Each structure stands twice: as structure tokens, then as C-alpha cells.
Write an enzyme that holds these catalytic residues in place. Structure first.
Site, PDB file in Angstrom:
ATOM      1  NE  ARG A  87      -2.393  -0.466   3.753  1.00 32.52           N
ATOM      2  CZ  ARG A  87      -2.346  -0.235   5.065  1.00 32.52           C
ATOM      3  NH1 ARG A  87      -1.616  -1.007   5.858  1.00 32.52           N
ATOM      4  NH2 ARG A  87      -3.035   0.776   5.590  1.00 32.52           N
TER       5      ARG A  87
ATOM      6  CB  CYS B  73      -1.434 -20.826  -2.221  1.00 26.71           C
ATOM      7  SG  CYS B  73      -0.918 -19.903  -0.743  1.00 26.71           S
ATOM      8  CG  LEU B  74       4.815 -22.808  -1.806  1.00 25.94           C
ATOM      9  CD1 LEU B  74       6.098 -21.981  -1.821  1.00 25.94           C
ATOM     10  CD2 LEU B  74       5.155 -24.264  -1.634  1.00 25.94           C
TER      11      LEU B  74
ATOM     12  CG  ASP C 193      -2.383  -7.060   0.105  1.00 23.00           C
ATOM     13  OD1 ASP C 193      -3.353  -6.573   0.738  1.00 23.00           O
ATOM     14  OD2 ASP C 193      -2.045  -6.629  -1.026  1.00 23.00           O
ATOM     15  CB  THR C 194      -3.563 -13.158   0.149  1.00 21.59           C
ATOM     16  OG1 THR C 194      -2.729 -13.932   1.015  1.00 21.59           O
ATOM     17  CG2 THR C 194      -2.741 -12.702  -1.051  1.00 21.59           C
TER      18      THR C 194
HETATM   19  C1  HEM Z   1      -6.398 -16.936   1.915  1.00 23.37           C
HETATM   20  C2  HEM Z   1      -5.082 -16.689   1.871  1.00 23.37           C
HETATM   21  C3  HEM Z   1      -4.258 -16.840   0.574  1.00 23.37           C
HETATM   22  C4  HEM Z   1      -4.636 -16.810  -0.724  1.00 23.37           C
HETATM   23  C5  HEM Z   1      -6.056 -16.592  -1.305  1.00 23.37           C
HETATM   24  C6  HEM Z   1      -3.448 -17.014  -1.544  1.00 23.37           C
HETATM   25  C7  HEM Z   1      -3.342 -17.067  -2.928  1.00 23.37           C
HETATM   26  C8  HEM Z   1      -2.236 -17.534  -3.659  1.00 23.37           C
HETATM   27  C9  HEM Z   1      -2.271 -17.922  -5.053  1.00 23.37           C
HETATM   28  C10 HEM Z   1      -3.544 -17.889  -5.918  1.00 23.37           C
HETATM   29  C11 HEM Z   1      -1.036 -18.289  -5.462  1.00 23.37           C
HETATM   30  C12 HEM Z   1      -0.662 -18.803  -6.896  1.00 23.37           C
HETATM   31  C13 HEM Z   1      -0.191 -17.651  -7.789  1.00 23.37           C
HETATM   32  C14 HEM Z   1       0.040 -17.945  -9.254  1.00 23.37           C
HETATM   33  O1  HEM Z   1      -0.179 -19.089  -9.738  1.00 23.37           O
HETATM   34  O2  HEM Z   1       0.444 -16.986  -9.969  1.00 23.37           O
HETATM   35  C15 HEM Z   1      -0.146 -18.144  -4.317  1.00 23.37           C
HETATM   36  C16 HEM Z   1       1.210 -18.428  -4.294  1.00 23.37           C
HETATM   37  C17 HEM Z   1       2.043 -18.391  -3.179  1.00 23.37           C
HETATM   38  N1  HEM Z   1       1.606 -18.155  -1.879  1.00 23.37           N
HETATM   39 FE1  HEM Z   1      -0.407 -17.737  -1.304  1.00 23.37          FE
HETATM   40  N2  HEM Z   1      -2.371 -17.175  -0.678  1.00 23.37           N
HETATM   41  C18 HEM Z   1      -2.819 -17.075   0.621  1.00 23.37           C
HETATM   42  C19 HEM Z   1      -2.036 -17.193   1.755  1.00 23.37           C
HETATM   43  C20 HEM Z   1      -0.665 -17.428   1.778  1.00 23.37           C
HETATM   44  C21 HEM Z   1       0.139 -17.587   2.969  1.00 23.37           C
HETATM   45  C22 HEM Z   1      -0.351 -17.530   4.427  1.00 23.37           C
HETATM   46  C23 HEM Z   1       1.404 -17.795   2.610  1.00 23.37           C
HETATM   47  C24 HEM Z   1       2.563 -18.009   3.632  1.00 23.37           C
HETATM   48  C25 HEM Z   1       3.839 -18.135   3.269  1.00 23.37           C
HETATM   49  C26 HEM Z   1       1.450 -17.759   1.154  1.00 23.37           C
HETATM   50  C27 HEM Z   1       2.578 -17.969   0.389  1.00 23.37           C
HETATM   51  C28 HEM Z   1       2.647 -18.165  -0.972  1.00 23.37           C
HETATM   52  C29 HEM Z   1       3.886 -18.441  -1.661  1.00 23.37           C
HETATM   53  C30 HEM Z   1       5.280 -18.548  -0.980  1.00 23.37           C
HETATM   54  C31 HEM Z   1       3.489 -18.582  -3.140  1.00 23.37           C
HETATM   55  C32 HEM Z   1       4.406 -18.902  -4.323  1.00 23.37           C
HETATM   56  C33 HEM Z   1       3.908 -20.233  -4.898  1.00 23.37           C
HETATM   57  C34 HEM Z   1       4.674 -20.606  -6.131  1.00 23.37           C
HETATM   58  O3  HEM Z   1       4.801 -19.807  -7.107  1.00 23.37           O
HETATM   59  O4  HEM Z   1       5.163 -21.749  -6.136  1.00 23.37           O
HETATM   60  N3  HEM Z   1       0.171 -17.558   0.669  1.00 23.37           N
HETATM   61  N4  HEM Z   1      -0.904 -17.680  -3.239  1.00 23.37           N
END
Ligand code: HEM
Ligand SMILES: *[C@@H]1CC(=O)N(CCCCCCN2C(=O)C[C@H](*)C2=O)C1=O
Ligand code: FES
Ligand SMILES: [Ca+2]
Lengths: 106, 405
Positions: free
Chosen positions: B177, B348-349, B242-243
Site C-alpha cells: 500500500r 499456494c504454498l 495482503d491476501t
Molecule cells: C487466503 C489466503 C491466501 C490466498 C487466497 C493465496 C493465494 C495464492 C495464489 C492464488 C497463489 C498462486 C499464484 C500464481 O499461480 O500466480 C499463491 C502463491 C504463493 N503463496 Fe499464497 N495465498 C494465501 C495465503 C498465503 C500464505 C499464508 C502464505 C505463507 C507463506 C502464502 C505464500 C505463498 C507463496 C510462498 C506462493 C508462491 C507459490 C509458487 O509460485 O510456487 N500464501 N498464493
């Protein structure tokens, strides 16, 4: 229905698995850590590898070419009854199915 | 603010949609995007805005595209492409097989086994935030809970001191932000500089925290560099702020507007995990995309090398082709399908950490503050982007209706 998960070390877990649920999804939901399920179930990672017992290989839908492609890069021994368990969708006809979980997914 | 139309693009697929400013946003950001899913809109449109790009408007195509990284590359997964400048977190922009190396490592710091042994410690955290908030009968949920909760969890699993929080908050804030008082590139670099001596220190004197594990891990068969480790450690921080902050706000906004769904979870807390999944489908919020590696016919459309396509994670679960009565929140919904965490090798990891943060926030909030509502005279505004969100969530309630535990 019920699915039995045999870890590499012989330890044995039987789970009650609702119809429509993948063998991967059920594993991850119940602390069967030797199934990782990294990609979350779209045949994109090979970390839900299992060996399906021969008594059920007639009874499971064959793998699609996508699952086949992904299976090439399993890290454990690739065998004829090797499956991505995110591709095994549970049904009453598969009740009491046996899968052996390999010593590694990564 | 539109770009010239590419000689390879037919006009009958052109569709006016700016993902940073959709028309009917006042109704709700999910509603605003769902305009892409009205009866006379093709499964695949072009827009001239934000530089110019394709959009998959339907769950089938989105999932397909996310399944084929040979044609749809992560090298440029943000729209517009200029929003990729200085964005070098890992493994966001990698494809298999290198991407895989970093997912194996990451699974060691946020995989289900780690989530599970962190749960009780997460709920005491959640409780503590809630418990010392309850007799106020009011709050800006967004500032008061949605923001402190995930960043406090990061500290916990990264093994970082509590007083480090104001600093990291600021930095991640400037990133998410912006203020005009710092560029994203500067804020990012500051985060890396914060991380990099911790990484080097814990590479040579390890703990069990996330940073140690990442700093001491191997990728591609040799030690992870300091550079690689900070770029991935950076994303484990930024990825889950942020998510989580925004999803919790969409959800909490819904429950404040819907006493009937509250009472259900209040009478049947056993439903909360299933309700979280339904809340995840209905209030999905990420939208990124991919870039074309080659010319490629796709669902009757000709794409060319360089083309960017938007593949909204949000739209799949709202696609009525995939869930009947999609804008309806039914906590007993029998076949919930969505791509809220994405799809394909990049899914998502933190999905398991994020589900657990939701379920605990719900199980711990309603346990204490069953009845609450939106502030009287409150214009709750949604913002639209790569991670859509809520601006603020002023909540109000009566202290005598609660229950400290
Ligand atoms: C409701 C909560 C969340 C949502 C809706 C969300 C959503 C996503 C999505 C849709 C992706 C895939 C992006 C793509 O294909 O371009 C992603 C990737 C990722 N997320 Fe989340 N996320 C959430 C929470 C978290 C949390 C708590 C973490 C903690 C570390 C996290 C870490 C990551 C990481 C490290 C990636 C990279 C995955 C990759 O490219 O292999 N996310 N997230
Ligand atoms: C839930 C979502 C989904 O796609 N699915 C499988 C589709 C089959 C329709 C359900 C029929 N059915 C039962 O009633 C038990 C097992 C089964 O396939 C789901 O189950
Ligand atoms: S979970 Fe990724 S292939 Fe089965
Ligand atoms: Ca520096």
C-alpha cells in the site's frame, strides 16, 4: 468408504473417506504426511505418489496421459501400479482399497 | 487509457475491462468481476486497458492455462508487465523443474506438518488479539486484527523478535500500500537487507525456525545462496499478508451482514472448517496471469509470443458452470470448487497455513464475540487489483453479548 494407507515402514492407517474425495485429499486432511500433495491435486507435482495394490488396479480408472507424464518424475521407485493419488477419486466400489506410500515424494 | 489493438486480435473478442477499476465495484469486488461471466461474454476476451491483455473468464480455461506452463509461462505473471519490474521473489516467476527445487524447500517451512504443530500457538495468538479487543464493542477489524494476526504468525515461524514488527509492517506496507514516501523497489531492498544477515547468521548457527531451514537447505543439488534464500524468505513474508488480511475482511464483512450464517457456526462450530472453504470460494480475491512462450491456438483463439493473459483465480468458483447459485453462501454446499489458492504447480504454498488461520480466527472470534455488525453509517469500500481487498471494516457490537474465555 474406507481406504488403507500403508507407510514405507509398514505402519498402517485406515481412513474413512467420503465418496468424491481423492486419496490425496483424504491423506493430507488426516496427518498422512508421507503424502505431500504439493500442487493440490492437478497432476502437476508427483508428490502424492502411491502404489495401488494389484487387487484394485482393475477397479481404478486408468491414469490419463497427464498423470502418466507426471509419473515419470516421481522421486521414489516408479512401479507398474504407481499412481498419483490425487487422480484416484474415491467410490463405494473402491471400498477397502490398499495403497502403499513410498519412502519419499520430494 | 487503452493501448493499440494488435493485428492478430479480432475486435469481436475485445471487451472493456480494467482490473484496477471495474465498473460496478461499489456492489462488491467479486460482483464487479463476475460481469466477465454474463451470458453474452466469450470464454476468452481481449482488453485494451492496462497495456492490453487476454482474460480467461471461466473456470475450465483458467484451470487449463494454469496446467500448461510450456505455453503459459510465469516469467511475467503480473498485469501490466511493468508491474514485474523489481519483482524477484522466489518462486513466483519460475517454472518447473527449477521451481520445484524451491517448493520442496518451502514445504519444509509451511507444509501441513509444520502448520499442525503451530496450531495451538496460533490460536493463543488469535485468542489474545480477540480477548483484548472484546469489551470495546467496536473495532476497525482490518487494522485491529486482520493486519496484526498474519504478521505475528510470520514472526513466530521465522523466529524473529516481536519488536521487529513495526519495521517489517512499514516495509511490507510500502510494498502493498504505497505512500509516495518509498518505492516498492526500495521497500523490497530494505526487507532483503533486514533478512540477509539473519540468513547468514543462521546458516552458520541454525535453529528450527523457517529462516534456518531455508538458509540451510539445498536447491538444484548445491547450497541455496544467500540471494536465493532472501528472495524466497521475502515471499513467505509478503505472500501471506495482503491476501490473508483481505480475505479475512471479506469474510468478516459477510458475517457482520449475515446473522443467519453466524448462528449456524455458533450452534455448530463443527461446520466452520467446511464454511471456511465456502467462504474461500465466494470471497476469492487473487487475479494474476501468465505470458505466452509461443504462438498458440487456444480454445479457438490465436495468441502470439509476448501476449499476456489474465487468469483470475477469483472467477472459477464464481463460474455458475462450476457452482450453482454462485453468489449464494451455503455452508452445506456439497461440491465446492474453486481456484482461490490458484492451480497447477504454483498453487499456494501457504494454503494449509492460510486455511488454519481462517478456521482459528472463526473458531476463536465467534467463541467470544458471537453477535456483531457493521458500524452504523459505514461506506465499506472494496479495492480491485492483483489481490483485491477491503479498505476498512469498522465493526460494532454490544459488550454484554460476548463471552471472554
Ligand atoms: C487466503 C489466503 C491466501 C490466498 C487466497 C493465496 C493465494 C495464492 C495464489 C492464488 C497463489 C498462486 C499464484 C500464481 O499461480 O500466480 C499463491 C502463491 C504463493 N503463496 Fe499464497 N495465498 C494465501 C495465503 C498465503 C500464505 C499464508 C502464505 C505463507 C507463506 C502464502 C505464500 C505463498 C507463496 C510462498 C506462493 C508462491 C507459490 C509458487 O509460485 O510456487 N500464501 N498464493
Ligand atoms: C462432489 C462434486 C463432484 O464433482 N462430485 C462427483 C460427481 C458425481 C456426482 C455425485 C454422485 N455421487 C454420490 O452421490 C456419491 C459418490 C458420487 O459420485 C462429488 O461427489
Ligand atoms: S498432488 Fe500434485 S500430482 Fe497429485
Ligand atoms: Ca542492501
Amino acid at each position: 468408504s474406507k481406504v488403507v494407507y500403508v507407510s514405507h515402514d509398514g505402519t498402517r492407517r485406515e481412513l474413512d473417506v467420503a465418496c468424491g474425495v481423492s486419496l490425496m485429499q483424504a491423506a493430507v486432511s488426516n496427518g498422512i504426511y508421507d503424502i505431500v500433495g504439493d500442487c493440490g491435486g492437478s497432476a502437476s507435482c508427483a508428490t502424492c505418489h502411491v502404489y495401488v495394490n494389484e487387487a484394485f488396479t482393475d477397479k481404478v480408472p486408468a491414469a490419463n496421459e497427464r498423470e502418466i507424464g507426471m509419473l515419470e518424475s516421481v522421486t521414489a521407485e516408479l512401479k507398474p501400479n504407481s499412481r498419483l493419488c490425487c487422480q484416484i477419486i474415491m467410490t463405494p466400489e473402491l471400498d477397502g482399497i490398499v495403497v502403499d506410500v513410498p519412502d519419499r515424494q520430494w | 487509457n487503452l493501448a493499440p489493438l494488435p493485428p492478430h486480435v479480432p475486435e469481436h473478442l475485445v471487451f472493456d475491462f480494467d482490473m484496477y477499476n471495474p465498473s460496478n465495484l461499489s456492489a462488491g469486488v467479486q460482483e464487479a468481476w463476475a460481469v466477465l461471466q454474463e451470458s453474452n461474454v466469450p470464454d476468452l476476451v481481449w482488453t485494451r486497458s492496462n497495456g492490453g491483455h487476454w482474460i480467461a473468464t471461466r473456470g475450465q480455461l483458467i484451470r487449463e492455462a494454469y496446467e500448461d506452463y510450456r505455453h503459459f509461462s510465469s516469467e511475467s505473471p503480473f498485469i501490466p508487465r511493468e508491474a514485474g519490474e523489481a519483482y524477484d521473489f522466489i518462486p513466483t516467476s519460475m517454472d518447473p523443474p527449477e521451481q520445484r527445487q524451491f517448493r520442496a524447500l518451502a514445504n519444509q517451512v509451511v507444509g501441513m506438518p509444520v502448520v499442525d504443530k503451530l496450531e495451538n500457538r496460533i490460536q493463543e495468538l488469535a485468542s489474545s488479539l480477540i480477548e483484548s479487543l472484546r469489551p470495546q464493542g467496536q473495532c476497525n477489524f482490518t487494522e485491529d486484527y486482520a493486519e496484526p494476526f498474519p504478521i505475528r504468525i510470520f514472526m513466530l515461524l521465522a523466529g524473529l523478535p516481536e519488536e521487529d514488527i513495526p519495521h517489517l509492517k512499514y516495509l511490507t506496507d510500502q510494498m502493498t500500500r504505497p505512500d509516495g514516501s518509498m518505492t516498492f523497489a526500495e521497500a523490497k531492498e530494505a526487507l532483503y537487507d533486514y533478512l540477509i544477515p539473519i540468513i547468514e547468521q543462521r546458516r552458520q548457527k541454525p535453529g528450527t525456525d523457517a529462516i534456518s531451514i531455508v538458509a540451510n537447505g539445498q536447491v538444484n543439488g548445491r547450497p541455496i545462496t544467500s540471494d536465493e534464500a532472501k528472495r524466497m524468505c521475502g515471499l513467505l513474508l509478503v505472500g501471506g499478508l495482503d491476501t490473508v488480511v483481505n480475505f479475512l475482511s471479506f469474510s468478516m464483512e459477510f458475517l457482520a451482514k449475515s446473522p443467519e450464517h453466524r448462528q449456524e457456526l455458533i450452534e455448530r462450530p463443527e461446520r466452520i472448517p467446511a464454511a471456511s472453504e465456502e467462504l474461500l470460494r465466494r470471497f476469492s480475491l487473487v487475479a494474476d496471469g501468465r505470458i505466452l512462450t509461443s504462438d498458440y491456438e487456444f480454445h479457438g483463439v490465436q495468441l502470439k509470443k509476448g501476449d499476456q493473459i489474465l487468469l483470475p483465480q477469483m472467477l472459477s468458483g464464481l463460474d455458475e458452470r462450476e457452482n450453482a447459485a454462485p453468489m449464494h453462501v451455503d455452508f452445506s454446499r456439497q461440491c465446492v470448487s474453486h481456484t482461490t489458492f490458484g492451480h497447477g504447480s504454483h498453487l499456494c504454498l501457504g494454503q494449509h497455513l492460510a486455511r488454519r488461520e481462517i478456521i482459528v480466527t472463526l473458531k476463536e472470534w465467534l467463541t467470544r464475540i458471537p453477535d456483531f455488525s457493521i458500524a452504523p453509517g459505514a461506506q465499506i469500500q472494496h479495492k480491485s487489483g492483483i489481490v483485491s481487498g477491503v479498505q476498512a471494516l469498522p465493526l460494532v457490537w454490544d459488550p454484554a453479548t460476548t463471552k471472554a474465555v
